Write a protein that binds this ligand. Structure first.
Ligand SMILES: NC(=O)c1ccc[n+]([C@@H]2O[C@H](COP(=O)([O-])OP(=O)(O)OC[C@H]3O[C@@H](n4cnc5c(N)ncnc54)[C@H](O)[C@@H]3O)[C@@H](O)[C@H]2O)c1
Ligand SMILES: NC(=O)c1ccc[n+]([C@@H]2O[C@H](COP(=O)([O-])OP(=O)(O)OC[C@H]3O[C@@H](n4cnc5c(N)ncnc54)[C@H](O)[C@@H]3O)[C@@H](O)[C@H]2O)c1
Ligand SMILES: O=c1ccn([C@@H]2O[C@H](COP(=O)(O)OP(=O)(O)O[C@H]3O[C@H](CO)[C@H](O)[C@H](O)[C@H]3O)[C@@H](O)[C@H]2O)c(=O)[nH]1
Ligand SMILES: O=c1ccn([C@@H]2O[C@H](COP(=O)(O)OP(=O)(O)O[C@H]3O[C@H](CO)[C@H](O)[C@H](O)[C@H]3O)[C@@H](O)[C@H]2O)c(=O)[nH]1
Ligand code: NA
Ligand code: NA
Ligand code: NA
Ligand code: NA
Ligand code: NA
Ligand code: NA
Lengths: 338, 338
């Protein structure tokens, strides 16, 4: 199929792009490069084994969106583009609402204009809010995210839902992601955060690589087995695969298809650390720090639905997630070149 | 003070503009005229007894907003501008999200740019969602509005809240309106809906004026005293006054000030009809019809908070609401001139 991948050059997008090309689809990448580099492009094509078309631009530019859509005869759109730093969203709410809410709004409006009716949105587990009921299931009513980032994702899911209701021919998938980690097995592609990494994995990686001193373990008094926070870590390649399957099986299938994308099991901070220590061949330095504001104690996804309906489930393990990360971190200490 | 009134030429805005001028404030009206006419302008100035400056434009145009803000040295902004047809919002969700959510976003972004930090937003009782607890109180957590319109209002309240948190010097009032009716005592200003009126009052008016046959009473089996739906009707002049007081007392007072704006009592459909029959000197034709989709049975506001904190309460009665409407309807059967 002909697919437009917004945010195609970022972490999740790049991996998804490779899988898509491998599946022989025609890929058009639209990215504004605020959080990625042109350097990834050649890697995508190499790994993907096919040439993806790249367009530098902003999802906020409806006129350009509309033009791309038409110009390439897009069939479906995968929307990864936006801002995701939680803490920063609290400090700069407007930018989040603008990039995420208005950003998606301008894109779907362009779609309407070009007669494109298949969409895939990068959502998040955050939309469940403070849910005591774990694992999280798609049948659960949504809650209230505590950050402008989380709120922005829920607001878009709502806007998409309403849009589908009004234009019932649309196929819209709301993919709720859990905690994406890992990198391409090649070790030539991976997450390349600028500055201080906000997520656990990259931070660990940066400690291991010798860039950082010690990993600060946000709270050790949680009501978990080991006292550290528990999450659902999902390999970026598994995530990418799920994106290809969702796209292929859902295209032209009217409705709003919500699916949690996770491993369906929880791992603590200690578990992750240990896995990385193992991967990198040296104990990862760490210390216990106070709980991070807004952090829930433990949650993971109930991924039965995606298994059942799309025959999708993860295949990579936690160890692989850590190994692949170390391999990329180690092979490209400076990430993507400028 | 120097105030920018978006949507200044519409129903609520025009009345508010008069009261503001009467209070000697300097008024700048910004309206795109999608739901109002330039004809109202001279009425505003006449009734207001002062000249308001008018600018034709769109809240969506951030650059223009920014320019107005600076250009007139605005101190505070009253934001009435947006779309409000509930049923239509269900049919055209994108337009609602765009005008309301993006629309406000572009405006507050312009404010930030021009260093304006006092805001008044036209919110709605709809934000409480399906609340069995009546009357509705500001301390109640918000619910989930069932239309894109309702959702759009809640989304903006959330975005404003987050913004205030990030820029704590801002004063933001979230004015939750109940059911606005009535018109200026002069009978020379009032609500001028185009096409089929969606609200009860105007519809009644149009039946009385001889434009419409019979009023369709949406459901007569509700669990109310008379079986018809019960609401909190609030005279547009009371509403306008509350806007002046809120603006004057809240300016430069940091925080998010939420206030319900209603009479604090409920009236049924029958009650309203009767009041209008009385006002117009002839029985208003009506019939019973099935319940309207999404209609709640009964609710009204708990307006104690505004009384206490701003010393504001309504002063007009239901009869006056009906009389003033009939007077305007009758004196200007064709509304504002083209
Ligand atoms: N990484 C996670 O932990 C996490 C968890 C849940 C959801 N998500 C969502 O998944 C998506 C992909 O995230 P990611 O980890 O790949 O992050 P990322 O930053 O690597 O990818 C986002 C990409 O979007 C681009 N972009 C940003 N705003 C843009 C705009 N207005 N116009 C055009 N391009 C724009 C960035 O330059 C970047 O290349 C995002 O929507 C993110 O919110 C990720
Ligand atoms: N009337 C009600 O029953 C009701 C109840 C709750 C909330 N509200 C809110 O109060 C506000 C005022 O409502 P109203 O009854 O006066 O309606 P209205 O339609 O008379 O007033 C809105 C005005 O905004 C203008 N406008 C619309 N979109 C615009 C845009 N993008 N840029 C610039 N101008 C724009 C319209 O032309 C109109 O003059 C609205 O935000 C409405 O949502 C009203
Ligand atoms: O330096 C660090 C970083 C993280 N953690 C802990 O590690 C766990 C994972 O934290 P993190 O990588 O930041 O991800 P999450 O907060 O769990 O990610 C959630 O939030 C993302 C952004 O909101 C998406 O919504 C995902 O779906 C969601 O599961 C948590 O228990 C953190 O307390 C630390 O102890 N130290
Ligand atoms: O032709 C009509 C019109 C209305 N009604 C009834 O009259 C009452 C009032 O209806 P309406 O004027 O449409 O206003 P509301 O739906 O009550 O207004 C609510 O919704 C507005 C738009 O959402 C704002 O949120 C207000 O705060 C809020 O109280 C309801 O019981 C309706 O069922 C009829 O029976 N026939
Ligand atoms: Na801050
Ligand atoms: Na960064
Ligand atoms: Na680098
Ligand atoms: Na429809
Ligand atoms: Na109309
Ligand atoms: Na007219």
């Amino acid at each position: 199929m002909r697919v437009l991948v917004t945010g195609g050059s970022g972490y999740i997008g790049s991996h998804t792009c490779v899988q898509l090309l491998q599946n022989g689809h025609d890929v058009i990448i639209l990215d504004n490069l605020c959080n990625s580099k042109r350097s990834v492009l050649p890697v995508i094509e190499r790994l993907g084994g096919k040439h993806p078309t790249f367009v530098e631009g902003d999802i906020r530019n409806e006129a350009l969106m509309t033009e791309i859509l038409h110009d390439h005869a897009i069939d479906t759109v995968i929307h990864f583009a936006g801002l995701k730093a939680v803490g920063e969203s609290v400090q700069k709410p407007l930018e989040y609402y603008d990039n995420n809410v208005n950003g998606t709004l301008r894109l779907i409006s362009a779609m309407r204009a070009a007669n494109v009716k298949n969409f895939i949105f990068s959502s998040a587990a955050t939309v469940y809010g403070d849910n005591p009921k774990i694992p999280y299931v798609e049948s659960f009513p949504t809650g209230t995210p505590q950050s402008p980032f989380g709120k922005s994702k829920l607001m878009v899911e709502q806007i998409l839902t309403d849009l589908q209701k009004a234009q019932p021919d649309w196929s819209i998938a709301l993919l709720r992601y859990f905690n994406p980690v890992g990198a391409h097995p090649s070790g030539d592609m991976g997450e390349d955060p600028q500055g201080i990494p906000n997520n656990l994995m990259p931070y660990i990686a940066q400690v291991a690589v010798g860039r950082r001193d010690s990993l600060a373990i946000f709270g050790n008094d949680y009501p978990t087995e080991d006292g550290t926070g528990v999450r659902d870590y999902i390999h970026v390649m598994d995530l990418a695969d799920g994106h290809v399957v969702a796209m292929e099986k859902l295209a032209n299938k009217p409705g709003v298809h919500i699916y949690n994308l996770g491993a369906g099991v929880g791992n603590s901070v200690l578990d992750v650390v240990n896995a990385f220590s193992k991967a990198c061949g040296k104990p990862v330095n760490y210390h216990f720090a106070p709980r991070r504001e807004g952090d829930l104690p433990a949650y993971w996804a109930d991924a039965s639905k995606a298994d059942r309906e799309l025959n999708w489930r993860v295949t990579r393990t936690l160890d692989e997630m850590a190994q692949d990360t170390w391999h990329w971190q180690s092979r490209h200490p400076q990430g993507y070149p400028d």
